[PDB]
Structures are given as C-alpha cells and as structure tokens.
Design a protein around this motif. Structure first.
Motif, PDB file in Angstrom:
ATOM      1  N   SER B  23     -15.359 -19.498  26.244  1.00 52.65           N
ATOM      2  CA  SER B  23     -16.236 -20.681  26.203  1.00 52.65           C
ATOM      3  C   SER B  23     -17.086 -20.899  27.453  1.00 52.65           C
ATOM      4  CB  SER B  23     -15.446 -21.955  25.921  1.00 52.65           C
ATOM      5  OG  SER B  23     -16.319 -23.081  26.034  1.00 52.65           O
ATOM      6  N   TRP B  24     -18.122 -20.081  27.667  1.00 49.86           N
ATOM      7  CA  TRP B  24     -19.188 -20.347  28.654  1.00 49.86           C
ATOM      8  C   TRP B  24     -18.830 -20.192  30.140  1.00 49.86           C
ATOM      9  CZ3 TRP B  24     -22.281 -25.185  26.469  1.00 49.86           C
ATOM     10  CH2 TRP B  24     -22.335 -25.101  25.073  1.00 49.86           C
ATOM     11  N   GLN B  25     -18.533 -18.947  30.515  1.00 47.24           N
ATOM     12  CA  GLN B  25     -18.849 -18.246  31.760  1.00 47.24           C
ATOM     13  C   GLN B  25     -17.990 -18.609  32.974  1.00 47.24           C
ATOM     14  OE1 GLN B  25     -21.787 -16.270  30.750  1.00 47.24           O
ATOM     15  NE2 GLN B  25     -21.585 -17.543  28.912  1.00 47.24           N
ATOM     16  N   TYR B  26     -17.101 -19.601  32.907  1.00 40.33           N
ATOM     17  CA  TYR B  26     -16.306 -19.913  34.091  1.00 40.33           C
ATOM     18  C   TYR B  26     -14.808 -19.980  33.794  1.00 40.33           C
ATOM     19  CZ  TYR B  26     -20.262 -20.530  37.276  1.00 40.33           C
ATOM     20  OH  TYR B  26     -21.366 -20.320  38.071  1.00 40.33           O
ATOM     21  N   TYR B  27     -14.358 -19.297  32.736  1.00 37.72           N
ATOM     22  CA  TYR B  27     -12.993 -18.777  32.648  1.00 37.72           C
ATOM     23  C   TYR B  27     -11.845 -19.780  32.635  1.00 37.72           C
ATOM     24  CZ  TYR B  27     -14.146 -13.925  32.450  1.00 37.72           C
ATOM     25  OH  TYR B  27     -14.591 -12.695  32.022  1.00 37.72           O
ATOM     26  N   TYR B  28     -11.611 -20.385  31.472  1.00 42.67           N
ATOM     27  CA  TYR B  28     -10.455 -21.246  31.236  1.00 42.67           C
ATOM     28  C   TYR B  28      -9.141 -20.462  31.199  1.00 42.67           C
ATOM     29  CZ  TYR B  28     -14.099 -24.487  29.734  1.00 42.67           C
ATOM     30  OH  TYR B  28     -15.216 -25.285  29.678  1.00 42.67           O
TER      31      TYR B  28
ATOM     32  N   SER D  11     -32.500 -15.672  37.251  1.00 38.90           N
ATOM     33  CA  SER D  11     -31.727 -16.748  37.862  1.00 38.90           C
ATOM     34  C   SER D  11     -30.989 -17.578  36.832  1.00 38.90           C
ATOM     35  CB  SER D  11     -32.691 -17.635  38.607  1.00 38.90           C
ATOM     36  OG  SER D  11     -33.466 -18.267  37.594  1.00 38.90           O
ATOM     37  N   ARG D  12     -31.722 -18.106  35.849  1.00 33.85           N
ATOM     38  CA  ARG D  12     -31.168 -19.028  34.868  1.00 33.85           C
ATOM     39  C   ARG D  12     -30.597 -18.249  33.688  1.00 33.85           C
ATOM     40  NH1 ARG D  12     -36.695 -20.260  36.695  1.00 33.85           N
ATOM     41  NH2 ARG D  12     -37.197 -19.917  34.483  1.00 33.85           N
ATOM     42  N   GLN D  13     -29.391 -18.612  33.269  1.00 39.30           N
ATOM     43  CA  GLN D  13     -28.711 -17.916  32.193  1.00 39.30           C
ATOM     44  C   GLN D  13     -28.311 -18.931  31.133  1.00 39.30           C
ATOM     45  OE1 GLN D  13     -26.129 -17.062  35.286  1.00 39.30           O
ATOM     46  NE2 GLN D  13     -28.056 -16.405  36.235  1.00 39.30           N
ATOM     47  N   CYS D  14     -28.162 -18.455  29.902  1.00 40.08           N
ATOM     48  CA  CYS D  14     -27.781 -19.351  28.822  1.00 40.08           C
ATOM     49  C   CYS D  14     -26.350 -19.831  29.014  1.00 40.08           C
ATOM     50  CB  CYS D  14     -27.918 -18.663  27.465  1.00 40.08           C
ATOM     51  SG  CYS D  14     -27.496 -19.728  26.073  1.00 40.08           S
ATOM     52  N   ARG D  15     -26.105 -21.088  28.649  1.00 42.69           N
ATOM     53  CA  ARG D  15     -24.757 -21.631  28.763  1.00 42.69           C
ATOM     54  C   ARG D  15     -23.792 -20.911  27.828  1.00 42.69           C
ATOM     55  NH1 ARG D  15     -26.430 -27.695  29.921  1.00 42.69           N
ATOM     56  NH2 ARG D  15     -26.402 -27.540  32.209  1.00 42.69           N
ATOM     57  N   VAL D  16     -24.229 -20.626  26.596  1.00 43.47           N
ATOM     58  CA  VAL D  16     -23.363 -20.006  25.594  1.00 43.47           C
ATOM     59  C   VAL D  16     -23.406 -18.488  25.621  1.00 43.47           C
ATOM     60  CG1 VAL D  16     -22.600 -20.241  23.194  1.00 43.47           C
ATOM     61  CG2 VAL D  16     -24.172 -21.921  24.200  1.00 43.47           C
ATOM     62  N   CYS D  17     -24.416 -17.893  26.253  1.00 40.17           N
ATOM     63  CA  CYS D  17     -24.591 -16.446  26.226  1.00 40.17           C
ATOM     64  C   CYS D  17     -24.787 -15.798  27.588  1.00 40.17           C
ATOM     65  CB  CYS D  17     -25.788 -16.074  25.345  1.00 40.17           C
ATOM     66  SG  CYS D  17     -26.039 -17.161  23.934  1.00 40.17           S
ATOM     67  N   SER D  18     -25.253 -16.527  28.605  1.00 41.08           N
ATOM     68  CA  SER D  18     -25.903 -15.924  29.771  1.00 41.08           C
ATOM     69  C   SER D  18     -27.092 -15.071  29.339  1.00 41.08           C
ATOM     70  CB  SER D  18     -24.934 -15.099  30.631  1.00 41.08           C
ATOM     71  OG  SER D  18     -25.540 -14.705  31.852  1.00 41.08           O
ATOM     72  N   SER D  19     -27.650 -15.387  28.170  1.00 45.58           N
ATOM     73  CA  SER D  19     -28.857 -14.733  27.683  1.00 45.58           C
ATOM     74  C   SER D  19     -30.043 -15.299  28.449  1.00 45.58           C
ATOM     75  CB  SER D  19     -29.025 -14.941  26.180  1.00 45.58           C
ATOM     76  OG  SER D  19     -29.144 -16.314  25.849  1.00 45.58           O
ATOM     77  N   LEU D  29     -30.753 -29.266  29.724  1.00 43.61           N
ATOM     78  CA  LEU D  29     -29.671 -28.691  28.935  1.00 43.61           C
ATOM     79  C   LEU D  29     -29.518 -27.188  29.141  1.00 43.61           C
ATOM     80  CD1 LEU D  29     -31.843 -27.658  26.628  1.00 43.61           C
ATOM     81  CD2 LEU D  29     -31.069 -29.647  25.344  1.00 43.61           C
ATOM     82  N   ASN D  30     -30.625 -26.444  29.211  1.00 43.30           N
ATOM     83  CA  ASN D  30     -30.634 -25.028  29.587  1.00 43.30           C
ATOM     84  C   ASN D  30     -29.831 -24.170  28.601  1.00 43.30           C
ATOM     85  OD1 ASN D  30     -32.050 -25.059  32.411  1.00 43.30           O
ATOM     86  ND2 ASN D  30     -30.550 -26.727  32.497  1.00 43.30           N
ATOM     87  N   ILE D  31     -30.358 -24.095  27.377  1.00 45.13           N
ATOM     88  CA  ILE D  31     -29.874 -23.181  26.349  1.00 45.13           C
ATOM     89  C   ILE D  31     -31.089 -22.497  25.722  1.00 45.13           C
ATOM     90  CG2 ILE D  31     -28.360 -22.945  24.339  1.00 45.13           C
ATOM     91  CD1 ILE D  31     -28.245 -26.184  26.111  1.00 45.13           C
ATOM     92  N   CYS D  32     -30.858 -21.336  25.110  1.00 42.23           N
ATOM     93  CA  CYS D  32     -31.951 -20.631  24.457  1.00 42.23           C
ATOM     94  C   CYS D  32     -32.121 -21.113  23.018  1.00 42.23           C
ATOM     95  CB  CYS D  32     -31.750 -19.114  24.515  1.00 42.23           C
ATOM     96  SG  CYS D  32     -30.366 -18.389  23.627  1.00 42.23           S
TER      97      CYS D  32
END
Ligand SMILES: [Mg+2]
Ligand SMILES: [Mg+2]
Ligand SMILES: [Mg+2]
Ligand SMILES: [Mg+2]
Ligand SMILES: [Mg+2]
Ligand SMILES: [Mg+2]
Ligand SMILES: [Mg+2]
Ligand SMILES: [Mg+2]
Ligand SMILES: [Mg+2]
Ligand SMILES: [Mg+2]
Ligand SMILES: [Mg+2]
Ligand SMILES: [Mg+2]
Ligand SMILES: [Mg+2]
Ligand SMILES: [Mg+2]
Ligand SMILES: [Mg+2]
Ligand SMILES: [Mg+2]
Ligand SMILES: [Mg+2]
Ligand SMILES: [Mg+2]
Ligand SMILES: [Mg+2]
Ligand SMILES: [Mg+2]
Ligand SMILES: [Zn+2]
Ligand SMILES: [Zn+2]
Lengths: 30, 33, 36, 49, 183
Positions: B23-28, D11-19, D29-32
């Motif tokens: 769930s989004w990049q910082y590892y629970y 620099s900026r990456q998607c919250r749900v993907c790092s896309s 919000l910063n999502i694709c």
RNA sequence: GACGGAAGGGCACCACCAGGAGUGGAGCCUGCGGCUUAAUUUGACUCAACACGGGGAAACUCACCAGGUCCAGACACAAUAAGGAUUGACAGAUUGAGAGCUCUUUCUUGAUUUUGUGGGUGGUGGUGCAUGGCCGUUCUUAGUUGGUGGAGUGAUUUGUCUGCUUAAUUGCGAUAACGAACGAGACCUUAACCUACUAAAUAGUGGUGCUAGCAUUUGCUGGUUAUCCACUUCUUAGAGGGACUAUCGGUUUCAAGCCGAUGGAAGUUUGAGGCAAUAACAGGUCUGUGAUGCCCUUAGACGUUCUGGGCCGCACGCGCGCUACACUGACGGAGCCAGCGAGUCUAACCUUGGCCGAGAGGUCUUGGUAAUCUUGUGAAACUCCGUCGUGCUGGGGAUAGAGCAUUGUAAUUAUUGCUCUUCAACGAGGAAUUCCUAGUAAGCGCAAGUCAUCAGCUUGCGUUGAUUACGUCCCUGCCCUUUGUACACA
C-alpha cells in the motif's frame, strides 16, 4: 457564500485509443 | 551492529517473523508471533 | 574483486574512533585509519 | 549511485504506483489519471453534468 | 488552503480502503464509515490486530503515541468461495438466492475471466428487479468489483444489488414513477 | 438469426439541400509513415491510427543505444564461524569521474555476508490472440424481455402491428391478445427571472460626523483598508415559486399531433449536458496499476543506478494545426470590456505596490491558505484619433547574422523571452474534403491541465456576433418490415 466547483477534466481511457472523450468530475464545497 | 539498531527500533522479513503489506511506497512492516 | 589479503599476522592515528586495532599503513607518509 | 533529481517528473511519483506518467499536480493529491478515476468517488468527486 | 484541504479529507479517506480490502479482507471487511462482515479477527487475539497497526497508523501516517444489502461487503462476501473451489454455476445463484428475499429488489452477479482458456467465459447471473438507469440508481444500487487471483488466469467479479425502494431506510420512498389513489 | 449488389418505408449537417466557415496549394508548428540511423524506445492505421497513450521528452522521464556501479538473489539445506570471515578505505596508474570499477599496498571494519546446490524474486521485457479492469465502436441508435391467453407436434410465433405521429417500441389507432417490467421518458447538474419571504466592509448602491476640486443659491465627480447611517435592485443563493407548449387561432379524421399568435424571463423536448437495456467485437491498453496467468529473465542482468547521446535527425508522401496573402487591412497613440478559474509550513506558490531597466528581466517590500490580496486578472478582436496609398512594399514574418536576459548540476541540435539588421514563398489555393442552424457558425483573446522550463496542444471561458434551412432521400450511411439463401465458423 458563493460555491466553487473543483473540476478535474481527465480523459476517460487508460490507453490512447478510442474517440477523444473527456469527462469532468466535480467537488462541490459549501 | 548496523543491523542491531533496528532490532528494538521495534518493541529477515522472510522466515515469517513479520508479515508484509505494501500500500504505497513506505512499507507497513507489521509483526508476527 | 579483492583480497584485503589474510595477513600472516601482524604506529597508529588519533581519536577514540581509531581503536588501537588501527596500526597505520606501512607505506610512507600514511596517517590513515582503515575505519573510514 | 545518485545525482541531482530535485524537480521535474523523475522527482514526483504516483502515490499508488510511483508511476511518473500522467501526473496531475492539482489540489495537492498527486496521482496519475490512469490511477485517479478508479479511486474517484470515495473523495467526494462525483459526476453531475 | 481550503480546496487543497477538503480534497485531503477525501484523499486521506481513500488510501485507507486500499489498506482495508488488502489486510482485513480474509478477516471480513465491508467499508469505512468500520462496517464489517466478520468482526473478531479485526480486533485480534484480544489485542493482536486492534493495535498492530494503529501503532503503524502513526509510524507511517504522521501521528503520535496517543491520537448483505451492500455489494462491497457482498462482492467479497464469498469471493473466498471461488478461490477455495466450488462450481461457478450454482454458487453464483446462491448469493442471488440469498439477498433477493432479504426484502430486496433485484441483484446481479457476473464473473469474467478464463473458465477454460479461450476467448474467456463471461456468464451472468441475475435475479429480481434492478432499476437502471438514471439518477434513481445512485440512490438504489450497490456494486463492487474485485480482481480474483487464481493460479492460471486472473478473473473478476462485478456484483450489483439494489435497495428495496419501499423499505428504503433513507431518502426517496419509492420509484419516481409512483402512482396511486383510492377507489 | 446473420447476410444480399432484392422491395417497401423511416432517419441523420461523422448525409444532401439552401447557404456559412474553413483545411488539402505557401512558410512554419506538431503527430504518422519513410528514411537515416550505434539508437533514432514505442503503441495505434477507416469512420473507430496520424496536437492520440496527457506523448508540450534538454537530465530525469526512458522504455533506446555506447558504456560504467550496485545487491536492494529474502529465506531453507549444505560451507569460510570463536587459530578473522568479511565490507569499507584516503591518495596514486585507470576511467567520463572527488569511483578503491580495478592494480599495486597494508592497513582495515567484525559471525553483519562472502560460495554452489536449492529457492527467490525485480522487469516501461513478450503474448490485449491466455487475462482482470477499464475503455472505445455498432450507438449524435429504439431497442429488449417475461406472466396468462391465442397459434403451432415442434424449434418458434402472437403480444412486439397496417395506418398515422413522435427525438424515441413516443403515442393515437388497429388488433388474439390482455395487462406488465427494463431501455427512451421520468430522474440529476448547469445558464438564465423572482423589484418576493430569507440575506452580509469579505457583495453592490444610495446616505452621514464630515473632506477634495468646477461652477457657485446646492448640484457636478469623488475620497474617507479598526469615521458613522442606511438598503436587498444589481451580485451572489438558502428555502422555494414559476412553464403547463398555458390560452386562442391554422390543419385535424375521432384523435395522437405538426406549422402560426399572444403572453412573454422562458416555445428545437425551454437551452446544454450526466446517467443508461438486451447483446456484441480475438477492438485498444501487460508502456497505469503491488492487476496480471504462463513463458523469457534473475550477478559481463532485460533488475536498479551513474555518465553521455537519441525519440526533434531530411531527395519525400500524409494528418490535427498556427501565422497570412493586406484598405471591413498593418503601424501608432488610446478608449479600456469580460467571464472561467488556480495559488506558500518545515515553505517559496499567486505577486499588488514601490524602485533600477530599452525590454527581457533585476531588485524591494507588501497583501494573499484566499467572495478579502494578486484582480475591476484595466484581455484581445475591439475601437476613437491619426497614419502607409498597392510592389510582394512595412502586407508576410520564414530562413539567416549580432548582442542582453530568465529556468535550471546541466539549455549545445537555437527551451523560452525582449532589441537591431535579415525579408523567403504566398498575389485567396486543383481533384477533393470538413464542420455547422442561435447567443449557433465564425472571429477574439483569457484561464486551468501540462509546467523546473517551454504551445502554434488540450479542457473549458467569456467579449463580438452573421448568412441560411426551420426541408428531402440525390449521394454516404443507419433502423423497422417483406423477401431469397446451399451461411450458423453466420
Ligand atoms: Mg516506474
Ligand atoms: Mg434518461
Ligand atoms: Mg452544400
Ligand atoms: Mg510503431
Ligand atoms: Mg509491447
Ligand atoms: Mg487494424
Ligand atoms: Mg461511428
Ligand atoms: Mg540516462
Ligand atoms: Mg524506470
Ligand atoms: Mg499489443
Ligand atoms: Mg404460451
Ligand atoms: Mg399449445
Ligand atoms: Mg417477437
Ligand atoms: Mg480485445
Ligand atoms: Mg514523440
Ligand atoms: Mg500536410
Ligand atoms: Mg513580480
Ligand atoms: Mg521577419
Ligand atoms: Mg497534447
Ligand atoms: Mg438513400
Ligand atoms: Zn584515523
Ligand atoms: Zn497511479
């Protein structure tokens, strides 16, 4: 107060094929 | 000892001994028994 | 690929950083601690 | 193993993907956009007209 | 701000359920409000899951030490049942057997994917009265969709239910067509 | 059932008429092919590929290539473990490199991981012909089913229809049907009007203790960011009202209704949309997904990264486009009109207002988390007053040289801007082809997305506002019947 709609116009498809159809979601504050 | 600072930053993610969920990049990283 | 070779076994620099297992390099001029 | 990547899209990456693709930097919000409409209605963003 | 704020009300409200039908699904999740199907395995071994990640709700999300008429509950109600193994023919009629005389108007369940590896099964299982559509559907439906990960070919459910507009329990009292008088 | 190059109907500015506005012809912008390439990453090819994957790529992205690091191969078994495994290392030759990549050197950090078996497992790597999801198209369409009854041995049919009529399986009517549900409709959002209740220095207007200036027996035009008083007409918008084709004509047939007229805030469903049935199609996306089956791969890596280049490279075809060919124009003062909208805490976003500047920009504060500030976004077309009298002349700004800035580790293959010289076609565009019926077409510029930066792009927005039809199948297509079939993979 006057309300301001928050509008996010994004195209309806994940890829880039189809007809170029957009769609605006609203956030309606008060 | 580099590894030893994190062992009680707490109170080998593999052998169970902690279950993982992304769930989004910082590892629970949340724990076993 | 390196060896840091096994040393058929064995001065010094400053700072309780360099902890007496720090015999300075046997070259010339060397004031060097393998720690850093 | 790293060099200046301060600004821009790397620099900026998607919250749900790092896309890095399809970023929408509106309303913080910063999502694709591939990503957003899936998670759209649960933010109170709905469709009226 | 205030715009960049009420979004953050919701966009915080959102990623939660990304974190909920991932960790509390087998433990029976229905929806934040916390709506649930099963509700002990959410607490834990009298304490194992209640606080296993409220302690992670903070040390990830910037905090401190101290602060069947729904489809999203029924589209996973028995999504287990498939990846455990039954007939996809009668099991699906069971759930629309289930909710329909629970005073409910209409229900519909589809399963899409490879039954047998081809251009892929898409058969559909309905029962009842399903208004669709206009505005009266936003009021009267619930629909969920959950990807089902079995070992050879992902599949996917699209459940829909509908609220009996008579026993509505909120909002409109019947279909906007409604007609009646006395003789 | 599907199909036909068979017959009826019916319908559409992705069809036509009547006309309007343009492209294809020129420069250049961009996307596609090509071609060239070390690589020019790639997907898509009819409507439904070609300013489309937010795809406006200087790093990144980056998938490409020329190179170079890394373990971020968990763990289970088996080996160097306590007579040092092992990583790190400053500088030097090396190399792009202040890289211990590596070599010499001898230090050195300390059961942390080094090696094979085994297992992992990351992947913008392949398969949208294995998939989820979603999306696009038939469809800017009117269709679809079941209960009881009727017809059939039956699959099936009727209902669901001649005829009108409607945007519509929308209805009048006809009827072996009757009564129904989904779809259309109803529903929901918005742009308008309410002199009404409910309303405010965050909105807008009079007005007062009073203040500024022309005329001067009281008006002209204001000013008064913690100076008083008022108002709900404007604004905005809470609760609601109001349009029902209302009423009366024209034509109906018995109506369903269509063409006028008045009311009029409002006559194409009031205008514009959101939703969306039964089914489809090897349609597009594994280059969105920690969605991904299975394969391919996993230590000279296809993983991740660092350095550099490339996607934009030009005998060429094409697609969306921008600047135009000039006297309803250009240059120049200048009058000065919007609306839609976004904006900064571990921080640099919206910049008034000063002040330096030729502008670009600099610098200096300042207000603004935002009906308060930027903002009356003092926009442009416009337009009033002047100017140049038709060459390719300044129209035209393309190619091209010189100089100043702004972003950014990094602008070279001009990111972008402002200044001076340059001044190329093009002299209204062939065969074709698009879009379009009212605050429409078209012209105009403005915001937002993109954004570190960059528009000739996108989504919207208001300023200005016509001509013409308010019709027909002639073409192109689509829907319903009838009919034929050796198709059912249709
Ligand atoms: Mg990525
Ligand atoms: Mg509707
Ligand atoms: Mg014509
Ligand atoms: Mg290609
Ligand atoms: Mg591919
Ligand atoms: Mg094709
Ligand atoms: Mg079409
Ligand atoms: Mg690179
Ligand atoms: Mg990458
Ligand atoms: Mg493909
Ligand atoms: Mg029967
Ligand atoms: Mg019978
Ligand atoms: Mg029938
Ligand atoms: Mg397909
Ligand atoms: Mg490109
Ligand atoms: Mg062309
Ligand atoms: Mg400024
Ligand atoms: Mg020029
Ligand atoms: Mg674009
Ligand atoms: Mg015809
Ligand atoms: Zn030392
Ligand atoms: Zn995403």
């Amino acid at each position: 107060l006057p309300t301001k709609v928050l509008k996010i116009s994004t195209r309806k498809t994940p890829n880039g094929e189809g007809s170029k159809t957009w769609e605006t979601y609203e956030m309606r504050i008060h | 000892e580099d590894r030893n600072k994190i062992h009680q930053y707490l109170f080998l993610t593999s052998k169970g001994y902690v279950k993982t969920q992304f769930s989004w990049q910082y590892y629970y990283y949340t724990l076993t028994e | 690929k390196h060896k840091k070779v096994k040393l058929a076994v064995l001065r010094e620099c400053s700072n309780p950083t360099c902890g007496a297992g720090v015999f300075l390099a046997n070259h010339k001029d060397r004031l060097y601690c393998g720690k850093c | 193993f790293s060099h200046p990547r301060r600004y821009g899209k790397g620099s900026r990456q998607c919250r749900v993907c790092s896309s890095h693709t399809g970023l929408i930097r509106k309303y913080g919000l910063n999502i694709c956009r591939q990503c957003f409409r899936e998670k759209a209605n649960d933010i109170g963003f709905n469709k009226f007209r | 701000s205030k715009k960049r704020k009420l979004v953050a009300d919701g966009v915080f409200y959102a990623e939660l359920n990304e974190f909920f039908t991932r960790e509390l699904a087998e433990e029976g999740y229905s929806g934040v409000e916390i709506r649930a199907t099963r509700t002990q395995d959410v607490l834990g071994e009298n304490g194992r899951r209640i606080n296993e990640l409220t302690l992670l709700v903070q040390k990830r999300f910037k905090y401190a030490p101290g602060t069947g008429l729904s489809a999203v509950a029924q589209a996973e109600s028995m999504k287990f049942k498939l990846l455990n193994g039954l007939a996809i023919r009668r099991a699906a009629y069971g759930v629309v057997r289930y909710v329909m005389e629970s005073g409910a108007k209409g229900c519909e369940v589809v399963v899409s994917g490879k039954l047998r590896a081809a251009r892929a099964k898409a058969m559909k299982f309905a029962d009842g009265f399903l208004i669709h559509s206009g505005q009266p559907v936003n009021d009267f439906i619930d629909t969920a969709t959950r990807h089902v990960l079995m070992r050879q070919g992902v599949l996917g459910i699209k459940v829909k239910i509908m609220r009996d507009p008579a026993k509505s329990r909120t909002g409109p009292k019947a279909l906007p067509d409604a007609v009646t008088i006395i003789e």
